[PDB]
Each structure stands twice: as C-alpha cells, then as structure tokens.
C-alpha cells in the first residue's frame, strides 16, 4: 500500500530481528487496517522503505506472530484471520479468514506449540483455535463482561490467562473439565504478561495505572506499585536472564521496571497513546515501542 | 411485513456497508458515529491535543439517509458510572459528544447500555442531554432478557453459578431498567431495545416486560437453531415471544456474523418474514380496533352534549349489538303474549335514546319475527338526529313509529310502555348515566313492564403500563390543576399493557328499580392476588350487560362478545405508580357519587400502600346531568 494508516496498533520483533507493524484507521472516511514488515527497524514507520504490506478489509485490535512466517490477525469484522509471509518476503498473502467472533476480536495469544492460538472478543466469548485445519475447537463463554486480554502460557500449550471487564482474572487448563480457575474487588484488569521462565508467576495491570505481581500457586497479591496514572494497555517482558518489564499506558508514557516494581526507565517520546512494545532480539537493550501519534520509538535501556 | 435493521460493530466504508445491508433487504442500520476502539481524552495532555478529525465526515451520506437508514451506537468504551473517576469524567464528555453529534447528524434513534446494576450517572448524562438543544432523537436502552453473568458457562471450577432458583435475581434485568427510567422521569424519548439470549428465562421474568415501550428487539445470530437443509430457524418458544413482540409492532435488529455460512445473510430475516406472513390473520374486532392501539380519548358529555352524524353512522356498523338487540326483544315479546292472543294484544314499545333509529328496525323486525303486534315511540334528546328519525318516519315507518323529541327524564306520555328499549351504556357501564336517565322514564313504564337491558355491571382489573402511565402523563393542559390529567378515566383500546389479576365486579344496576328509596350512589372495596412483581398503573374499566334472559354483551376479555368494537376498555389513572411485589394484594376503592347536577367516581388504592384520594368532589371530571 502507498499509504499507512495513522493509528499503529502492535510492534513486534521476529527472531532474525525484522519488525511487524499493525496499524489501523480509527478515523476519518476509511476504517480499515493494515500489516506490515520491516528488515529496517529504523526506516519504521516510513512505507517507502517496507520489505513488504498489505491491505485488511477491517482495522487491527491486536496481532502476533505465529512462529517466523505467519500472522495472526484480531479484527474489529469479527474475524479472527492468518496471514502468510511470502518465501521472498516480499508479499503478504492471506490463509484463512474466519467470522466466528459476533463482535470486535480485541486480543489474541498463540500457544507454546505454534499450532494452536486463542482469541478474546468483545462477543464475551474465549475461543481456541487449530491454526492448521483453520477451525474453532472450542469456545468458552466464561466471563459476563468484553475480554480484554487473553495471554497463553509460555511453556504449557493447555494453559492461559484471561482478564475481563467482569473483574475476572481466569487460569485456564483445557485438561481439566471445569477449564476456567477465578485468580482473586480492585479495578479491572486490563494487561497480562506472563513471567518468561518463572511459568507460575504472572504480571497484570489494571485501568488505575497499577501493575500487580501474582503467584498463581500462592494467590496473595505479592507486590504491587502505582506505576501509571491512566489503564495499562501492556507488559512485556525483556529476554534478558533477569528480565525487565516494559509498562505501557494511556498517560502516553512507558516504563522499565525490575523484578522488584521499581522505576528504572521513562520515555514521554510519544504525545498519544502508548500502544505496544517490543524488546529487541539483537541488542537486549533496544526496545521499541509505537504509538497512536504514529511515532514508532528505539529506546536504549540501561 | 416486518420492519428490521442490521446491527454491526464495524464499519470499513460507510457507503459500501450501508449499500451490502440495503440489498440483503434491511429497512435500516445500527452502527457507530465514532470507532468503537477510538478512545479519546478530554482533561489531560498530550493524548487531549490529538489531532483530529475525531470521526467520518457528515457528507458521506445525505440529510434524508441519515434520518432514515442509520442508528447510532454510544462507544462500548464510554463507562459513565467506572469506579474509577478519571474514566468517569472523560465517558461524561465522551457520552456528551457522541449523543451532540447524533443529534446534529439528525439520527432518528441511538443505541445504549443498560449492562450492569449502576446507571446512575449514565442516566444523568443522559438526562442533561435531553434538556439541552432542541432535538427530536430517539433513545433505545440495549437490555438482555438475561443478564451476560447469569448465561455463562458452567466452567469458573472454584466459582459456579448458581443452580438454585431465585425468583427476584432472574429478574434483576427488569430492575436495571426501571430504575434508569425513574432517574430519567419517565422520558417519552427513552425506549427499550430488549436483548432476546439463546436460552429463554423462565416465563415471569418475560412477562416483567409487559407494558413497557419497546421498540426494538435484539436477535444475535447465534441464537438460530438449524434445521435439516441447513437454514436459521427458531425454537417453537422463541417463536412464541416473536409473536407476542409482533403484536406489538416493535423493530427487529440482527445481530452478529452469519453462522449458517453456507447461505446468504438474508436468511435470518426470511424467518421473520415468513413468520410475519404466518401470524393468524386479524378477527373482526381488531379490523376496526386496529389505529386505536393504546390511544387516549378523554371523558366525553352524553347529556351536555350531542353526537355528530358520523359518530352515529360508525357505531350502526357494529355486526352483534343490534343483531343482539333484535333477539332480546324478539324473546320478551313471545313471553309477554300468547299465540292465541297474536292479533288482540299490540304491544307498546318506547326506545329511549333512539339515536338515529337502527334499534327501532330492530323493534320492527323482531315483531315481524314473533310474528306480533307492536306500537313504538322513538325518544331522542338529540335535535340533529330527531332530523333523520323524523324522515326515517315519514318515508318509512309510518304512523307506527311515534317520535318525540326530548329527554326521557321530561318527557310526558300518552301511554305507558309494555317494553323500555334502551343504549344508554359506557364502557364502565353506568358512565352514561344510564341508572339516572332510566330512573327518570319507569313512571312510565307498566307495573309488569320489562326494561332492556335488564341490568349490567362494572369490571375492573389492575392493570401495569408505563407506556399508558406516559400517555396521562402527557395531557397535561395549561389553566388547569397540573394533575387533573389523572384523575378522569380515559376510554383506550388498551394494547402495551399487563393485566395484573382477573377482573372482579364492581358496580351493578337492575331495571326497572322499584326499591322504594332509589339510590345510585355506591362504595365498593376489591382485593385483587397479584402473583408477579410489578409496577401499578391504574385499573382497566369492562362492563357486561343483561338485555334480556340469556341474551347479553360484554367488553369483559373473558366473556367478550365477539367482534363488538362498538365500546374500548376504560382506564382510571392513578397520581403515582405504585410497586407490587409477587404475592402482595392490591386493594381499591371506588366510590360512585352525585348530587343533582352532576355524577362521578371517586377512587383510592389501601393496599399495598395508600394513594390520595382521586377526583375528589368531582374536581377533575364529572358527567353533567
Ligand atoms: O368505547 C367507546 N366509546 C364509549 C361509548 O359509550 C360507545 N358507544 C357505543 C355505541 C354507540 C352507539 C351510538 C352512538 C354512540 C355510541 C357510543 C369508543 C369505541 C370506539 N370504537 C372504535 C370505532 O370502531 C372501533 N371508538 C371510540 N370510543
Ligand atoms: C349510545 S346512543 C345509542 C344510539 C342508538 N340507539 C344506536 O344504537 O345507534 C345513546 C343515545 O340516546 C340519547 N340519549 C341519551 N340520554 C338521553 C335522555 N336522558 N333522554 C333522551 N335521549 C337520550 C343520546 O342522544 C344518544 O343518541
């Protein structure tokens, strides 16, 4: 496309180390999405200098790699869709595109395997999906508000969390036959991150600008800080073998957090809304972020 | 034909998307004026200083289509009532310019939530907006039949929902909205969009819904069973709520993706069509009721004043009350003479209140019938319609018929009658006055003489309507008490309405009344079982009537006489609604009262709580005399 839409929704870095974008139009006479890839992290978000784009019927609510050639698509149509990379990597193609969602399709999450993902929706519904046969195994109306967030385990393929504007924060385990498990009125949790080598501790924010450290086994809120002063959009963890937590709000600002809560690193770099981040494969101390001001930032974290 | 609308949540391009409904044969659509994802700040930068524009442009459809074609949808983010308050305030504005910008754009109707316990301040925000600007929009509440908490999945291991019965708490979705409409003062802009869920709730807390102004009903698309050639169908229970919803000529709305992908969209709404085109056609009672549906017409004066021509010409056309009439006189007259006496005994009838003559026919051809031997007087207080009985007679009926030109109550006869022949009948029975009138005219009847009718009596049934209660409300008039509107009873083919317990007799007359003191003044109390929760809006008025032995007619539902449209139910009022809980009694009082000039009702509501005193003295409405 000759043109990229104003609003970057997600960014994520592949393992080579290119970028992912999704974008989409949340105004003007067009409202649509988009996809796209860049070999140079700094020639984002400029659509001249892409390795490759396409166009979305509808605009882009979340987004993920699956595995180093697929993208798998939340869209606000509904639908749940993947898209395949080219071999060139030059063209983006589309595999499947399933209406299976009655409302927006806010999060997605890919399991461990790479086979499967699982999707939440404003429709209320969980559903959990057969990449390869492009089906719907099962679907799960668990909670009675919009699933905000839905994140699968890192190791576990049968294992996920979800948070809703019920006030639910739910661990799943599709083994047993009652999947969902109520993790416990604060204000409704709107990010989840699982922990990348803990598998038993996870990170959630609230709409208060509050990120919260949870053991799963222990279920006492162990640590909590008042790290924002607008809803957490985001949390995600640095590759590093002592992993630091980026932090992204509404207050248009993101934050570097230890293990501890503690305050290391800030950027006001974007004047809009802080809408994703992604920590660099290749230098663990670039991570950049994107936003709704169309910036797409490199921050180096000391 | 059903009139429908697609519900949609995205939107790509406007033109494109309102031209793929259009075809697939959707009357209208409900989508949003702003990105359902588009959050905006309001207090604090830089997120405040976002470069706009903040929506599509106006000019992408015309002035006619935005009237006609497009529902407008308040942002699933806008949460006026959030815990927390940075959320408050920014949904406050946020509400404030979508519902501005829906006004500007002149849509006929916009969609909100009701989705939760606490509207408070939605329902504020909502109000402010209503007494701002001058607009004519429509508000539909987006309501579930049930609550999303109570349709869950039995899947939350260490939290299960509740298997239990809870009679109140399966209702809780009526609440929701009574509550944000009694914040709102009754707005006749705020209607209800029920939400109809792939499980039905138990047939109470439908029957909640009774009453209330829908206007639109909700069907997701994954509420549609299947049938064997791979079709959207419904079950057989469904169908019985799309009816009744039918009846009530609400808007239907689909919506959600296509789930029978391998048939075209339009199939969900073929159901309702087809089931449109399946409902029983109208009986002869709803041909003529039918454009009267909930409609209010205040108490008119039957001695004070007179008929116009065509009130008369409608009411001829009734096809029982005269057939009925010619029957019972056709009864009295074998029993008051013999077969052998068919040529000796002629029979002096006098219809009081002849009208412009049709129960004098009646008289003509139930003589003809008993093969006997009549002589008629034809009374009539109405100048304008002795015109056309004085030509009916002259042209027609000969020096059979006398006519007399006066009032009942003055007139002096020659001789006395045999047989009174009267119509003098409200819709309570005696609102006509037709006990005072008769009362005045059997000095004039024979010692044996019959009297048709016979006698009648009053029904009355409490009854739940905030439509109705809306509608009163609404007749308030300048230079008078700003209540009277209240306290009168209102004839009305009632419609939106529930009927909260069976009807019980209230007030009854026997003619002739040879009761040495004659008094029509009357205090009656009734204890109606109410067995669901509800609101009280008034009584509904019926009536039955005894013309003669076993003939007889009734506006009464039960005993109804059918295709009778010649009386609508009656409706009194009262100043305040009044909250009946399942199991409670409602006791009300009715006082008949009159002094010489003048007759009227009193009525009071004892339990489950008092209500004041209504129209006393007369004060609102009386019937002159
Ligand atoms: O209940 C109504 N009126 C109360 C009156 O006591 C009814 N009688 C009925 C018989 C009658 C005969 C001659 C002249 C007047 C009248 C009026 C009512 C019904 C209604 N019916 C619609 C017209 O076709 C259905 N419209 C408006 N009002
Ligand atoms: C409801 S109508 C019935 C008219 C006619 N019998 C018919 O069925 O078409 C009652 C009629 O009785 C007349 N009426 C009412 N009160 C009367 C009275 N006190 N004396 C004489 N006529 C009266 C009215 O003018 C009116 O035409």
Redesign the pocket.
């Given at each position: 496309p000759a043109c990229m839409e104003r609003q970057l929704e997600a960014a994520r870095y592949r393992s080579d180390g290119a970028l992912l974008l999704g974008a989409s139009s949340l105004s003007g006479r067009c409202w649509a999405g988009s996809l796209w890839l860049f070999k140079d992290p700094c020639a984002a978000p400029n659509e001249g200098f892409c390795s490759a784009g396409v166009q979305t019927e509808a605009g882009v609510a979340d987004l993920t790699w699956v595995g180093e050639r697929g993208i798998l698509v939340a869209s606000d149509s509904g639908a749940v869709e993947l898209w395949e990379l080219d071999e060139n990597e030059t063209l983006i193609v589309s595999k499947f595109c399933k209406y299976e969602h009655d409302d927006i399709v806010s999060t997605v999450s890919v399991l461990s395997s790479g086979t499967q993902a699982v999707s939440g929706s404003k429709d209320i519904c969980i559903k959990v999906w057969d990449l390869a046969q492009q089906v719907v195994l099962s679907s799960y109306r668990a909670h009675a508000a919009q699933v905000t967030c839905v994140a699968a385990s890192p190791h576990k393929d049968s294992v996920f969390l979800s948070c809703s504007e019920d006030n639910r924060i739910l661990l799943w385990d599709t083994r047993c036959p009652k999947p969902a498990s109520q993790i416990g009125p604060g204000y409704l949790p709107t990010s989840l991150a699982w922990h990348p080598q803990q598998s038993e501790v996870f990170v959630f924010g609230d709409e208060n600008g509050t990120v919260s450290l949870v053991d799963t086994k222990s279920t006492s809120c162990v640590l909590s800080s008042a790290v924002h002063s607008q809803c957490v959009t985001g949390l995600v963890f640095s590759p590093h073998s002592v992993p630091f937590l980026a932090s992204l709000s509404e207050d248009c600002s993101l934050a570097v957090l230890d293990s501890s809560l503690s305050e290391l690193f800030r950027s006001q770099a974007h004047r809009d809304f802080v809408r994703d981040a992604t920590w660099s494969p290749l230098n663990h101390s670039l991570l950049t972020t994107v936003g709704w001001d169309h910036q797409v930032v490199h921050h180096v974290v000391p | 034909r059903v009139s429908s609308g697609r519900d949609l949540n995205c939107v790509p391009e406007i033109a494109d998307t309102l031209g793929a409904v259009a075809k697939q044969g959707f009357d209208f659509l409900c989508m949003p004026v702003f990105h359902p994802r588009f959050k905006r700040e309001f207090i604090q930068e830089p997120a405040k200083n976002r470069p706009g524009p903040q929506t599509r442009s106006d000019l992408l459809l015309s002035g006619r289509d935005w009237n006609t074609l497009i529902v407008g949808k308040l942002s699933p983010w806008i949460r006026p009532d959030s815990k927390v308050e940075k959320i408050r305030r920014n949904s406050e504005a946020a509400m404030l310019q979508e519902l501005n910008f829906g006004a500007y754009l002149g849509l006929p109707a916009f969609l909100l939530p009701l989705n939760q316990e606490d509207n408070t301040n939605l329902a504020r925000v909502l109000t402010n907006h209503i007494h701002t600007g001058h607009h004519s929009s429509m508000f539909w509440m987006r309501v579930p039949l049930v609550a999303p908490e109570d349709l869950r999945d039995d899947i939350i291991e260490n939290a299960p929902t509740t298997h239990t019965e809870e009679y109140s708490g399966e209702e809780k979705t009526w609440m929701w909205w009574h509550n944000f409409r009694t914040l709102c003062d009754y707005s006749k802009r705020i209607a209800v969009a029920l939400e109809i869920g792939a499980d039905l709730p138990s047939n109470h807390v439908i029957d909640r819904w009774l009453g209330e102004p829908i206007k639109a009903a909700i069907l997701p698309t994954s509420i549609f069973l299947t049938n064997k050639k791979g079709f959207p169908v419904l079950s057989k229970m469904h169908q019985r709520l799309i009816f009744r919803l039918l009846k009530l000529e609400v808007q239907f709305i689909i919506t959600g993706t296509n789930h029978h992908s391998e048939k075209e969209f339009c199939s969900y709404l073929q159901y309702l069509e087809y089931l449109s085109q399946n409902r029983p056609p109208p009986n002869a009672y709803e041909l003529?009721?039918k454009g009267?549906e909930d409609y209010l017409?205040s108490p008119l004066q039957p001695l004070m004043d007179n008929?116009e021509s065509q009130?008369?010409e409608?009411?001829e056309k009734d096809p029982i009350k005269y057939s009925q009439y010619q029957q019972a006189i056709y009864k009295c007259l074998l029993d008051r003479v013999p077969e052998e006496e068919k040529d000796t005994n002629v029979q002096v009838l006098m219809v009081l209140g002849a009208?412009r003559g049709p129960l004098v026919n009646a008289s003509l051809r139930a003589a003809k019938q008993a093969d006997r031997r009549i002589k008629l007087y034809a009374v009539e207080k109405n100048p304008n319609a002795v015109v056309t009985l004085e030509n009916w007679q002259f042209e027609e009926w000969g020096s059979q018929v006398t006519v007399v030109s006066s009032d009942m109550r003055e007139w002096v006869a020659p001789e006395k009658a045999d047989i009174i022949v009267s119509?003098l009948?409200?819709?309570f029975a005696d609102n006509?006055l037709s006990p005072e009138c008769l009362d005045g005219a059997q000095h004039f009847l024979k010692d044996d003489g019959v009297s048709i009718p016979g006698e009648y009596t009053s029904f009355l049934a409490p009854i739940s309507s905030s439509k109705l209660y809306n509608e009163v409300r609404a007749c308030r008039e300048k230079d008078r008490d700003p209540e009277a509107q209240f306290e009168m009873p209102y004839?009305v083919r009632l419609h939106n309405f529930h009927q909260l317990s069976a009807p019980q007799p209230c007030f009854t007359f026997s003619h002739p009344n040879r009761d040495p003191m004659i008094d029509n003044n009357r205090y009656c109390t009734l204890e109606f079982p109410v067995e669901v929760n509800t609101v009280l809006h008034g009584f509904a008025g019926y009536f039955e009537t005894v013309l003669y032995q076993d003939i007889t007619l009734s506006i009464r539902p039960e005993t109804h006489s059918p295709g009778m449209?010649?009386?609508?139910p009656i409706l009194f009022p009262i100043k305040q609604p009044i909250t009946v809980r399942e199991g409670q009694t409602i006791c009300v009082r009715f006082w008949r009262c009159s002094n010489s000039k003048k007759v009227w009702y009193e009525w009071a509501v004892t339990a489950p709580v008092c209500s004041a005193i209504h129209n006393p003295t007369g004060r609102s409405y009386t019937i002159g005399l």
């Open positions: - | 003529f009721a009267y017409q008929l009130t008369y409608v009411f009208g119509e009948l409200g819709s006509e004839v449209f010649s009386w609508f």
